[PDB]
Design a protein around this ligand. Sequence first.
Ligand SMILES: [Cl-]
Length: 292
Amino acid sequence: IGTGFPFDPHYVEVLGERMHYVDVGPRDGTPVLFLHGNPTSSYLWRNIIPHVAPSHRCIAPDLIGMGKSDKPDLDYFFDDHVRYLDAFIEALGLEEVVLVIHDWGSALGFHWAKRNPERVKGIACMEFIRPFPTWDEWPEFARETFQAFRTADVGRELIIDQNAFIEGALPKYVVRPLTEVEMDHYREPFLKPVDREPLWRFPNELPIAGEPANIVALVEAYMNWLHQSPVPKLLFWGTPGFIIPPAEAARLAESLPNCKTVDIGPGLHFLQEDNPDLIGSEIARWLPALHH
Ligand SMILES: [Cl-]
């Protein structure tokens, strides 16, 4: 599995801040917009993009405060990411897109899709955010971890002071062992502890046990949208998975319209690190029928 990042840098000024992005592939078709989540960056897509670039433009931003994007002193609420990603999409003059989304990038992407339904020609998703109505519905072995992340003071000590999301959660939720070179790519944006604010706010935004109410409501709304939308969907899932267990992937395959599901094999949360070649090849194969 490749560890390099052989993509020329691009930066765009968004809300007074520079945002970094990958931009490869032909200019004259529907772009494919790749959205990472926590605590990752466009690096997460590095081995997937090359499968898609031959046929479509591939755009993969680093969310504000992450990757090689600038680091304003924000609270880094989901709403802050919404504001910056909306403005990124417009700054690039995008019209119609295909989304490829994961984790908080999936909350961003589904929320954008719900608000812009005529501009989304397909959604490939994996390990995406849905409401967790109670803590018993969160993966059992990660309940303590995430309860502590969301606990006054303690969560900041773990994630900001001790870098627990990068050094702990990220490799824990990849089945194969991440190499030191890969870890260094993920560590680089966060070498200064104070710059870890997004990494702490994100788990505090997760829609778990009804809190925070604004996120629970907007995630319920995009899921209601998704359940009645005819947009083509491509859902990748792994075993045992993490926030999309195999039985949930099967439920979604039946319930969501026009949804194709692909088993990637072993996987927890960062499925892209366990089987990027199948994810990329299946996205590439699925795109042509979306054009018409
Ligand atoms: Cl999170």
